[PDB]
Assembly symmetry: D2
Homo-oligomer: 319 residues x 4
């Protein structure tokens, strides 16, 4: 019942645990970045560019998250969609955490104003040798914290840690993320499937037959609903809230899927498992995949357990 905010949640789960403060401040700083990304995505100031005072979003998001993570004095390696190679933090500002993020996911189609988001996934540095790109190559199992911000009909940050998955709604009136769902867990089975079917020609037989099973029920029930926005963050958030399954399977145009492991697949897979769901690559679990490159693509099928398991059974049959 009693109120609580994202700032207080992270400075109290971090308070009530050892207390180095770096991860508290990293997350602290990270929401402040997201709040700034939100106002820019809501186009708050477009009038000054169009002549109110008189005579980039994907780039600006990357700058904000980087800048802030750097100033947090808690990051040593930083991997992003935009920056090809990793970003080794200047000595002065280094901490002990490796952060992998997609600063604006879906801005390929931001000109139609579709829901976009910010995906993040925090690792701690295991190695002793001087920081490097290779420190980002940890398996998804090793995620200290992951989550995503959604810039949709409203802004929401979904934080996943060992203590569970907690969903915060940005009240733009006060500039504060408000806790509106505690320790969320996904439905066991849903009525929704999320898939780009223009690649129907190029599907695995198992993916094809699972969709046929959903479209044309094999147990004389009701067919599922198709819901594909075109931005992972939105579809996954629906898959959390409403239940169901999300699929970006391996094609032939993309033999390894399209969604990147380190900063797209793994963070969403962590959120799913920490909330009673599951995510798999078909053959191995997304979190158990060991990266060899930081921009490594991966197939990913995440969502409600009784559905992903149904998929997985069909994967047995077609392998």
């Amino acid at each position: 019942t009693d109120v609580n905010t994202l700032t207080r949640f992270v400075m109290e789960e971090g308070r009530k645990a050892r207390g180095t403060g770096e991860l508290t401040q990293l997350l602290n700083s990270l929401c402040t970045a997201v709040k700034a990304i939100s106002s820019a995505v809501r186009k708050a100031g477009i009038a000054h560019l169009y002549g109110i005072a008189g005579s980039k979003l994907d780039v600006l998001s990357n700058d904000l998250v980087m800048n802030m993570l750097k100033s947090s004095f808690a990051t040593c390696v930083l991997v992003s969609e935009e920056d090809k190679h990793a970003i080794i933090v200047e000595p002065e500002k280094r901490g002990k955490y490796v952060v992998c993020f997609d600063p604006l996911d879906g801005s390929s189609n931001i000109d139609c104003l579709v829901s976009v988001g910010t995906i993040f996934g925090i690792y701690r540095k295991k190695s002793t040798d001087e920081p490097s790109e290779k420190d980002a190559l940890q398996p998804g199992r090793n995620l200290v914290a992951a989550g995503y911000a959604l810039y949709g009909s409203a802004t929401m940050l979904v934080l996943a840690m060992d203590c569970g998955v907690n969903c915060f709604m940005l009240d733009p009136a006060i500039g504060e993320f408000i806790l509106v769902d505690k320790d969320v867990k996904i439905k066991k089975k849903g009525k929704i499937y999320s898939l780009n079917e223009g690649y129907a020609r190029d599907f695995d037989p198992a993916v094809t037959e699972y969709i046929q099973r959903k479209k044309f029920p094999p147990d004389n029930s009701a067919p599922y609903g198709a819901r594909y926005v075109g931005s992972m963050v939105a579809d996954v958030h629906r898959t959390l809230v409403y239940g169901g399954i999300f699929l970006y399977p391996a094609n032939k145009k993309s033999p390894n899927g399209k969604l990147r492991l380190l900063y797209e697949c793994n963070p969403m897979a962590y959120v799913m498992e920490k909330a009673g769901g599951m995510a798999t690559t078909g053959k191995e679990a997304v979190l158990d995949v060991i990266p060899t490159d930081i921009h490594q693509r991966a197939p990913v099928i995440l969502g409600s357990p009784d559905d992903v398991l149904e998929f997985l059974k069909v994967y047995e049959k077609h392998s």
Copy 2:
């Protein structure tokens, strides 16, 4: 040389003679659209969840209703959220009929997916005293029509005889900034939009069209698939990037789902004033004369060439 909706709306009105009522209708309407935005972005949510201690469908409809009522430019008012028509009280009557969906796609509003307002303004056909028949005009007679997208940012799209204009809201000052003038649509796209969870129930014409897209017949490249589940969001994508949108008829919806007067007709008028088309398969959406204010209709809108590619497949199976 900044050009706001409120400025646009009274120069296009002055550039079209006439009283000034429609300007003040669109002013009141967009003021309500600004207040829907505020609630949809969840401003004040902390007070509900107990920052001091201790519904959107309805709120959105109340905002639109009170604003259009107070505008002195409405006689009949038709909404999703009202089974009957709203005969505006005589002291506040105007010369226009507004058919609107206050918040479209709110069924799945809890996933925080793009919702929107849809509207379409007619001019009274009445001679004496208004009635719900004034809303029962074909889409061809639409004075003005458009929508507002509460997505990545809030955009009002306004189609009129002078064309389709897109205004971005600037939340900092609450002004709609003209960012796209007289918009026209790609002649053909690589996007298709429908709910394939009804594939069991689709017409043979529909099914073949999708096979043509999933499996190009001319050995080109397969089209793309996008169904947000919200008409504003899908229509606006079909406007911006191009492509095709369908919510066709099937056996368990012989008349589609999407309503005529406050969903299909408004989006058809946008598309046709932007160079796209909009058909039910047999008539064009704007050419259906309604019999019921909550009448349902099939809709296949989008880029011109794409709807033509459909209509050829449709005629073959009929």
Copy 3:
């Protein structure tokens, strides 16, 4: 009755009079600049000046950016011909493409000299009409305040409020920073006939002529054995004048030695607040004549001003009438 926004009220009243629509157009563009000023004064985006994104239009002083906003909104309205401002020594003649009927005199950000202490500041405006038959010039701004089509201010205080005086009367609108509309909160307001506040800079006590020095003692030591008036001086005209509109009372900025002909500017401070006051049942006097009756010879002309509640202003006037 029902909700109303500044936007309809302006374009409603501008249709109840047929009318060109320029005044409506002007009042809108002026409004839109006012919301813009408010958002900058509330320091929105101050974080992008302090390294939020790392590196970089508006590294401007707020009083300048305000002026630029009001200017580039007014010119673009196609309703203005001559524009007078405090931040401009000469009147701005609008280009022949965007010329209109009305002459506007304004103070973009009044009180910004102490905006460091975050004091209430505001935008004072006043709309005349070109009465001249010849091309626009700084002469056209030299009209008496009697010839005001409309006047008012926007107070950027605990909240942002636009006060609009016309022949209608005075109409108070509050900005809802959520939706970005001015909401009609008070309609056709009038001032309290008499009040219990007095407002002036008593640091200039050494240079007060006897009329002021007596009246002030009549308030601190009342003659009728009643109760002393309260002393209230923000140091920002929009602030003190607005309090005098809501609570009643009196506001004085008179003749000194340092500035013997007043300080407060006539065309874009005194005259507009006099129109507000007179249209709301109050008075505004120079001591000699009434403020609205003063005949300008220069655009940046100063003037002594004593405005406020009717009984209060007249009480002072009897005291000045003893000394002349």
Copy 4:
């Protein structure tokens, strides 16, 4: 390199080890201030005037209250708006005592004058059970104090033993941005501030001192009068531009009007830390042992040389 208050209030804590409770207090306090600013600037005023169909003292108090109880860092809470010391429920208790005025100057708020939230943080010293007594500490024992000014913009002024620090609220992101660091006051000023309507009732000492500033002794230049009527507003001017602020004993209030624990004592700590001075004419405001939570006190604060000059005149007449 940006510095927010959520960073600063944690950095200082980490540097002093400490549980994390003074941090959470202030972090929770600031969210309350962010919410009060929203209310004061009239966000949602449209809905009170019927945009969709059809108190601030109390809301501000409820906000501070509920946020501080939720902080898990308070045991005793003292406010204007409750004639009682509020003792926090055992499950939500910390070790600090907060004496606060949630909205000061809202007396004269219909004219929209600058208002503000004043606060001061003590630490429970009695081994006893949390009670009103724990708040009756002299201001000297203060861990932290300050105020939130809701004027031109919103600023949180935060005084501690690491100096006084000013934080500007950026409504675009809801973040208090550090803009003036380790601030310090001019040793002498040119501005004076008091209600001269109470002239008939002032100390002969006060009356001389004002003469001494209105008509200078060294026939130099006079000071400038500035009385807003909101202590936060006047005091913040006196922090920035310098000068003096008085609310001395007249007769209707012969022991001052301004409340010691939650009006005078917090402002004294700010001045003190920023190199200023704050006296009752007898003793330092921080050195007044309180008897009642709502106890009033004569307050004279500002630039040190100017406060001393008043004190010189006081000693003559005393």
